[PDB]
Design an enzyme around this catalytic site. Structure first.
Site, PDB file in Angstrom:
ATOM      1  N   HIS A 119       0.808  -1.223   0.000  1.00 39.83           N
ATOM      2  CA  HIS A 119       0.000   0.000   0.000  1.00 39.83           C
ATOM      3  C   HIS A 119       0.840   1.271   0.000  1.00 39.83           C
ATOM      4  O   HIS A 119       0.597   2.193  -0.784  1.00 39.83           O
ATOM      5  CB  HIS A 119      -0.956   0.004   1.209  1.00 39.83           C
ATOM      6  CG  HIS A 119      -1.696   1.293   1.404  1.00 39.83           C
ATOM      7  ND1 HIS A 119      -2.999   1.464   0.984  1.00 39.83           N
ATOM      8  CD2 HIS A 119      -1.336   2.456   1.997  1.00 39.83           C
ATOM      9  CE1 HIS A 119      -3.401   2.684   1.288  1.00 39.83           C
ATOM     10  NE2 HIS A 119      -2.415   3.310   1.911  1.00 39.83           N
ATOM     11  N   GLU A 120       1.839   1.345   0.874  1.00 39.32           N
ATOM     12  CA  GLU A 120       2.606   2.571   0.966  1.00 39.32           C
ATOM     13  C   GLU A 120       3.392   2.854  -0.326  1.00 39.32           C
ATOM     14  O   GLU A 120       3.537   4.002  -0.715  1.00 39.32           O
ATOM     15  CB  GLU A 120       3.568   2.532   2.155  1.00 39.32           C
ATOM     16  CG  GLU A 120       2.866   2.507   3.505  1.00 39.32           C
ATOM     17  CD  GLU A 120       1.895   3.647   3.704  1.00 39.32           C
ATOM     18  OE1 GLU A 120       2.135   4.754   3.187  1.00 39.32           O
ATOM     19  OE2 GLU A 120       0.887   3.441   4.415  1.00 39.32           O
ATOM     20  N   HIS A 123       1.700   4.862  -2.787  1.00 43.00           N
ATOM     21  CA  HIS A 123       1.918   6.285  -2.568  1.00 43.00           C
ATOM     22  C   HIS A 123       3.270   6.749  -3.107  1.00 43.00           C
ATOM     23  O   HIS A 123       3.357   7.806  -3.720  1.00 43.00           O
ATOM     24  CB  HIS A 123       1.839   6.654  -1.085  1.00 43.00           C
ATOM     25  CG  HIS A 123       0.480   6.461  -0.497  1.00 43.00           C
ATOM     26  ND1 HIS A 123      -0.662   6.924  -1.117  1.00 43.00           N
ATOM     27  CD2 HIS A 123       0.075   5.856   0.645  1.00 43.00           C
ATOM     28  CE1 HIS A 123      -1.714   6.618  -0.375  1.00 43.00           C
ATOM     29  NE2 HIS A 123      -1.294   5.965   0.693  1.00 43.00           N
ATOM     30  N   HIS A 129      -5.297   7.690  -2.117  1.00 37.72           N
ATOM     31  CA  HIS A 129      -6.273   6.695  -1.684  1.00 37.72           C
ATOM     32  C   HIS A 129      -7.410   6.532  -2.685  1.00 37.72           C
ATOM     33  O   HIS A 129      -7.772   7.480  -3.375  1.00 37.72           O
ATOM     34  CB  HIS A 129      -6.830   7.040  -0.308  1.00 37.72           C
ATOM     35  CG  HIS A 129      -5.820   6.912   0.785  1.00 37.72           C
ATOM     36  ND1 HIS A 129      -5.650   7.879   1.751  1.00 37.72           N
ATOM     37  CD2 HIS A 129      -4.904   5.950   1.049  1.00 37.72           C
ATOM     38  CE1 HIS A 129      -4.685   7.511   2.574  1.00 37.72           C
ATOM     39  NE2 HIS A 129      -4.222   6.344   2.175  1.00 37.72           N
TER      40      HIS A 129
HETATM   41  C1  LIG Z   1      -1.965   1.607   6.837  1.00 36.30           C
HETATM   42  C2  LIG Z   1      -1.888   1.323   5.339  1.00 36.30           C
HETATM   43  O1  LIG Z   1      -2.569   0.073   5.069  1.00 36.30           O
HETATM   44  C3  LIG Z   1      -3.568   0.207   4.184  1.00 36.30           C
HETATM   45  O2  LIG Z   1      -4.072   1.300   4.024  1.00 36.30           O
HETATM   46  C4  LIG Z   1      -4.068  -0.950   3.463  1.00 36.30           C
HETATM   47  C5  LIG Z   1      -3.557  -2.203   3.514  1.00 36.30           C
HETATM   48  C6  LIG Z   1      -4.381  -3.014   2.689  1.00 36.30           C
HETATM   49  C7  LIG Z   1      -4.356  -4.360   2.334  1.00 36.30           C
HETATM   50  C8  LIG Z   1      -5.330  -4.865   1.485  1.00 36.30           C
HETATM   51  C9  LIG Z   1      -5.268  -6.287   1.105  1.00 36.30           C
HETATM   52  C10 LIG Z   1      -5.027  -7.341   1.940  1.00 36.30           C
HETATM   53  C11 LIG Z   1      -5.039  -8.468   1.103  1.00 36.30           C
HETATM   54  C12 LIG Z   1      -4.800  -9.857   1.524  1.00 36.30           C
HETATM   55  O3  LIG Z   1      -4.955 -10.177   2.685  1.00 36.30           O
HETATM   56  N1  LIG Z   1      -4.344 -10.735   0.605  1.00 36.30           N
HETATM   57  C13 LIG Z   1      -4.061 -12.125   0.972  1.00 36.30           C
HETATM   58  C14 LIG Z   1      -2.581 -12.254   1.276  1.00 36.30           C
HETATM   59  C15 LIG Z   1      -1.741 -12.984   0.456  1.00 36.30           C
HETATM   60  C16 LIG Z   1      -0.395 -13.086   0.758  1.00 36.30           C
HETATM   61  C17 LIG Z   1       0.122 -12.455   1.895  1.00 36.30           C
HETATM   62  C18 LIG Z   1       1.560 -12.567   2.223  1.00 36.30           C
HETATM   63  O4  LIG Z   1       2.415 -13.041   1.302  1.00 36.30           O
HETATM   64  O5  LIG Z   1       1.979 -12.243   3.319  1.00 36.30           O
HETATM   65  C19 LIG Z   1      -0.732 -11.719   2.720  1.00 36.30           C
HETATM   66  C20 LIG Z   1      -2.072 -11.625   2.403  1.00 36.30           C
HETATM   67  N2  LIG Z   1      -5.259  -8.059  -0.136  1.00 36.30           N
HETATM   68  N3  LIG Z   1      -5.390  -6.791  -0.156  1.00 36.30           N
HETATM   69  C21 LIG Z   1      -5.648  -6.002  -1.362  1.00 36.30           C
HETATM   70  C22 LIG Z   1      -6.320  -4.023   0.966  1.00 36.30           C
HETATM   71  C23 LIG Z   1      -6.355  -2.713   1.308  1.00 36.30           C
HETATM   72  C24 LIG Z   1      -5.389  -2.186   2.168  1.00 36.30           C
HETATM   73  N4  LIG Z   1      -5.189  -0.937   2.664  1.00 36.30           N
HETATM   74 ZN   LIG Z   2      -2.388   5.218   2.399  1.00 33.87          ZN
END
Ligand SMILES: CCOC(=O)c1cc2cc(-c3cc(C(=O)NCc4ccc(C(=O)O)cc4)nn3C)ccc2[nH]1
Ligand SMILES: [Zn+2]
Ligand SMILES: CCOC(=O)c1cc2cc(-c3cc(C(=O)NCc4ccc(C(=O)O)cc4)nn3C)ccc2[nH]1
Ligand SMILES: [Ca+2]
Ligand SMILES: [Ca+2]
Ligand SMILES: [Ca+2]
Ligand SMILES: [Ca+2]
Ligand SMILES: [Ca+2]
Ligand SMILES: [Ca+2]
Ligand SMILES: [Zn+2]
Ligand SMILES: [Zn+2]
Ligand SMILES: [Zn+2]
Lengths: 169, 166
Positions: A119-120, A123, A129
Site C-alpha cells: 500500500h505505501e 503512494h 487513496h
Molecule cells: C496503513 C496502510 O494500510 C492500508 O491502508 C491498506 C492495507 C491493505 C491491504 C489490502 C489487502 C489485503 C489483502 C490480503 O490479505 N491478501 C491475501 C494475502 C496474500 C499473501 C500475503 C503474504 O504473502 O503475506 C498476505 C495476504 N489483499 N489486499 C488487497 C487491501 C487494502 C489495504 N489498505
Molecule cells: Zn495510504
C-alpha cells in the site's frame, strides 16, 4: 523547453530503494522479503524496475521510526497511524516510513508488513487513496487469510494510468 | 483510484507575491527591484500580471533561508544548491526560497539575484529545466555582463505554450 508533468510521477523507470533501518519485530531477511514482494506487486504490472541499494541515496528511502522522526508527520505511538509515504519528488519524495510503535509481522499476528508496504509504495509511486472498497489503496488495513495475493483491478488501472503496463505478458 | 494531480499552470492570470524577508547582501531597494524585474521577464511575454502584497498570504511567497528552513528541502551552505521553487498550485505551490548562505548581488560579485529569481519564477509558473544550453531554464548559472536582459526564445516558447502570448 519543458513543462511539468500533469501528475506526480517518476520520470524514470529504474528506481532504487534502500532499507535504512530495521524493526525489532522481524528478521532482516523477513523484512527484505516483505519489501521485495511489495515492490514486485507494482513492477509486475508496469515497466518499473526496483533495485536495492545498501547505502547512499535511493529514490525510495525506507525507515522505521517513532513519534517525531524527521518530517511534518510524527507518529503517535501504538495503534492509530501505522505508516505513510511521500509522492514522487525530490529529496524525501518517494520515501516510506513505518511506525515502530506498531507490531509488524510476516504473518497475521500484528500488521502484515508486506501488505502495508505494498500500500505505501503505491503512494511512493504516485497513487493516492481509492474509494473502491476492494482496492489495495483503500485506506483501511485488512488481511484476508488466503494464500495468494492479487493486486485489485482498481490499483492496476491507477498505476498503469501513470506508467503504462510494461510487458503485458 | 486517485493520483496526485499536478497543476500545469495557474488558473488565474493575476498573481500576487510577497517578499517575506531580505538578504543581508543587498539593500531592500535592490532586492525589490530584482524581484520586480524577474517577474517582468515573464509578464512581458504572457498575459500574466504580478502585484506585490506587503502582508498576509500571496500566491508566490518569496523568502531567504539557510539550511533547514521549514520545508525539509534543506539548503547546504555556500555553493551547491542556490535556490528552489514550488510548481503552481495552492499552499506552498509557487513559493520561491533563496539560500542566504550564498552571496547575492545586484551585479556580478556573487550570484545575480535578478537572474536566479527569473529562473526560479519560471518554475513557479510551471516550467521545468530546459535542455537548450541557451535557455534561461537551463540549469546552469551564467552572467553575460550585458546591461539588457533578453528572454531566450526557448523560454518564450515554453511559457507561451502554457499561458499564451501577451
Ligand atoms: C496503513 C496502510 O494500510 C492500508 O491502508 C491498506 C492495507 C491493505 C491491504 C489490502 C489487502 C489485503 C489483502 C490480503 O490479505 N491478501 C491475501 C494475502 C496474500 C499473501 C500475503 C503474504 O504473502 O503475506 C498476505 C495476504 N489483499 N489486499 C488487497 C487491501 C487494502 C489495504 N489498505
Ligand atoms: Zn495510504
Ligand atoms: C538557480 C540557478 O539559476 C540558474 O539555473 C540559471 C540562471 C541563469 C541565467 C541565464 C542568463 C543570464 C543572462 C544575462 O547575464 N543577461 C544579461 C543581464 C542583464 C541585466 C541584468 C540585471 O538587470 O541585473 C543581469 C543580466 N541571461 N540569461 C538567459 C541563463 C541560464 C540560467 N540558469
Ligand atoms: Ca501508531
Ligand atoms: Ca526520496
Ligand atoms: Ca516494533
Ligand atoms: Ca503559495
Ligand atoms: Ca548553497
Ligand atoms: Ca547572504
Ligand atoms: Zn514520516
Ligand atoms: Zn525551501
Ligand atoms: Zn531550476
Amino acid at each position: 523547453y519543458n513543462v511539468f508533468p500533469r501528475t506526480l510521477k517518476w520520470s524514470k523507470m529504474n528506481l532504487t530503494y534502500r532499507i535504512v533501518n530495521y524493526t525489532p519485530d522481524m528478521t532482516h531477511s523477513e523484512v527484505e522479503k516483505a519489501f521485495k514482494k511489495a515492490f514486485k506487486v507494482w513492477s509486475d504490472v508496469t515497466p518499473l524496475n526496483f533495485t536495492r541499494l545498501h547505502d547512499g541515496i535511493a529514490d525510495i528511502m525506507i525507515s522505521f521510526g517513532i513519534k517525531e522522526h524527521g518530517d511534518f508527520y510524527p507518529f503517535d505511538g501504538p495503534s492509530g497511524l501505522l505508516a505513510h509515504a511521500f509522492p514522487p519528488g525530490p529529496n524525501y519524495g518517494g520515501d516510506a516510513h513505518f511506525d515502530d510503535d506498531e507490531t509488524w509481522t510476516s504473518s497475521s499476528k500484528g500488521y502484515n508488513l508486506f501488505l502495508v508496504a505494498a500500500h505505501e509504495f503505491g503512494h511512493s509511486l504516485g497513487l493516492d487513496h481509492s474509494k473502491d472498497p476492494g482496492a489495495l489503496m483503500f485506506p483501511i488495513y485488512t488481511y484476508t487469510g488466503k494464500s495468494h495475493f492479487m493486486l485489485p483491478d482498481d490499483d492496476v488501472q491507477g498505476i498503469q494510468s501513470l506508467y503504462g503496463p510494461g510487458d503485458e505478458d
